[PDB]
Structure formats: C-alpha cells, structure tokens
C-alpha cells in the first residue's frame, strides 16, 4: 500500500497515493489534473460523488469501474489507475480514477480547423478502428458526439465517455445532446443495439466535410422531419419493425418523400466520402454499414490495414440482469479496486 496524504482543494478532501503531485482542479465527481511521477504523464484523477447512495448508484459505479478496466485501444481511454485509501471493506466509501489528461476534443478542431479530405479520413477511420473493438466486445457507446472524442496535435484520436445509462431534461430543444442520437433511440422506436453507434459516427463525418451540424433540431420532433427529408420516409418493412402502435402511426401521418441525391447535399465532397455516407445514414438500422465493413471501405484505403485492427478479449455482462443489494454491489466494487494491475 503507498503512502496517502490528505489535502482539501475547493471544499472537497482529496486522499491521494504520493505519487500524484501538484493537483489543480478542472472540473458524477470531481476532477483534478496532477502529474503522476511514477509514469510522468499528465493525468486527470476524478474523485466519484456518492458512489454508494443507492442500489442505482451503487450499480452504475460497478459498470463504470468494469468497463473502464477491460478497454486496451490505442484509440479507447484506458484506465491507468483506480485506487482508495481504505483499508478495508468495513471503512471503504471513496473511489478515485486515473486516467490521461486530455486537451482538446473534436470540436476544438471543427469549429477552429481548416481540415482537408486527408483529415477527415485519419479521423473517421480511428473512430472506426476503435468502434471495431468497443463492438466486438458486445458493448454500445451511445453517446458519440464531438465533445467526447479526444484529439492531439498530431491528429490522433481517442473515444471516451462511454454511455453509463443521460435525462429527460438533458435530451431536450436545441441541444447537442440529442443532434447525434440514431431515430430508434431519439423516438424509444424498437429495442436498439450496436447500429445506434454508426448513425453517429455518419452525423460526425458530415460535420467534418461541411462545418455545419447535420441535424441541428430543435426538439425531438423538429430533428425527425430534418433526418426524414434527407434520408427519405420509411417503407412498410422497417414500419412493421417499429413497436409502438402511436408511434406508427404518427409517422404515417406525414407525407411522403424521397431519399435525396447526397452528391446535391455535400456539394465537392470526395465522391468515396459520399458513398460511405449513404451506408452510414440508412434508417432501418438492420442495413446500416458496420464497423468492420466500413474499414475496408475504399475511402480508408491509405490508412486500412486488416493485421492492425485488433479485437478485444470477451466481456461478460451478465452483471446487468443480477439484483443485489447495495452493500453487494459495493462489496463487488471493492474486489476490483484491489485487483487492478497496471499497464506495461
Ligand atoms: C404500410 O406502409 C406505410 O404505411 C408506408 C408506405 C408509409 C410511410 C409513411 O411515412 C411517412 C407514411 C405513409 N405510409
Ligand atoms: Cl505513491
Ligand atoms: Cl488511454
Ligand atoms: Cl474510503
Ligand atoms: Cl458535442
Ligand atoms: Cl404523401
Ligand atoms: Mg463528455
């Protein structure tokens, strides 16, 4: 066990190994940036608020710590530490992570870059490498958008915030919140899965090329008439895979229209760019390109490279459907806090 040593920053006691230094607040917890001296990185070290103050919480946190725990991508955050200062079970209650510090994000680049085609296709391809591993473990994102993809200056890429299961509140008007979201989840349409990931990564591509949010809603509904007059009204085949009977028929109540030619619509775009954005932008999610098959799209061909484009190891998830109680689901949380190994 390190030697802890104790400090309060802006009305919150931070307990911490003597290897952080020099902590410096930044920001579901509180954030400092410190420099970690037995790595020499730049880290970010979030304290987690009432990690424990229900059965809700107490869950969220386990899947937090167990998803953070099996993510080793070079384009996934990883977790470089996770530590607490008790020294038993009996009189644990705080759980702090560590992981890099993170600079800019992809709007700090869209909004202030000029990014040619070359850009755009090293970073919609690292989304891709990374979203490749993230499914092949059965796990779902959720929340891709700009803010929560990490990028350097040399162009590298990281995904990060992973969904942990967002608000009504938060999901409301003219919100980038929600600008990114697939239909079936936006609309709750039909039991979704890994497909709502890719329709974000095809909203995200179109900013890059043009500048300009694709789908800037101003509530849910406004957002629905701006997909469906790019991507055309549904057929009778994906209709009957909508669950909802007022749901149907709320969309059988608008007129309908036709998918429009999207060399009209991102006027000069490299015509292979245009051709991934069809496959991405499909709203039947059952046809949707996937990750692996966008890879080895042709518009990636200077950056695919099929032996550099790992998978992850399985990840059980059966957690999910287990009804424990909170002391449970802390005592669980305490055995991976103490069974965490570093990486290399
Ligand atoms: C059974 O199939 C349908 O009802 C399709 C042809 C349909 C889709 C609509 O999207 C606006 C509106 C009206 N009718
Ligand atoms: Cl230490
Ligand atoms: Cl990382
Ligand atoms: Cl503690
Ligand atoms: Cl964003
Ligand atoms: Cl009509
Ligand atoms: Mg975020």
Redesign the pocket.
Known sequence: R??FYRQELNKTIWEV???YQNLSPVGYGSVCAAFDT?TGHRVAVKKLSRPFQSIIHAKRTYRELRLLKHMKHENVIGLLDVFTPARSLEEFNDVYLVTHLMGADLNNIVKCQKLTDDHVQFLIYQILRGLKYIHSADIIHRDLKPSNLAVNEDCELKILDFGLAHTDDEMTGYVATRWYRAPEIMLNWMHYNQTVDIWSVGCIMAELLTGRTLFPGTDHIDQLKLILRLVGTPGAELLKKISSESARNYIQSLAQMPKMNFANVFIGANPLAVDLLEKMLVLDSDKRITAAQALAHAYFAQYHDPDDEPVADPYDQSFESRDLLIDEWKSLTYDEVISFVPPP
């Open positions: 390190p030697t190994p003597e290897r037995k």
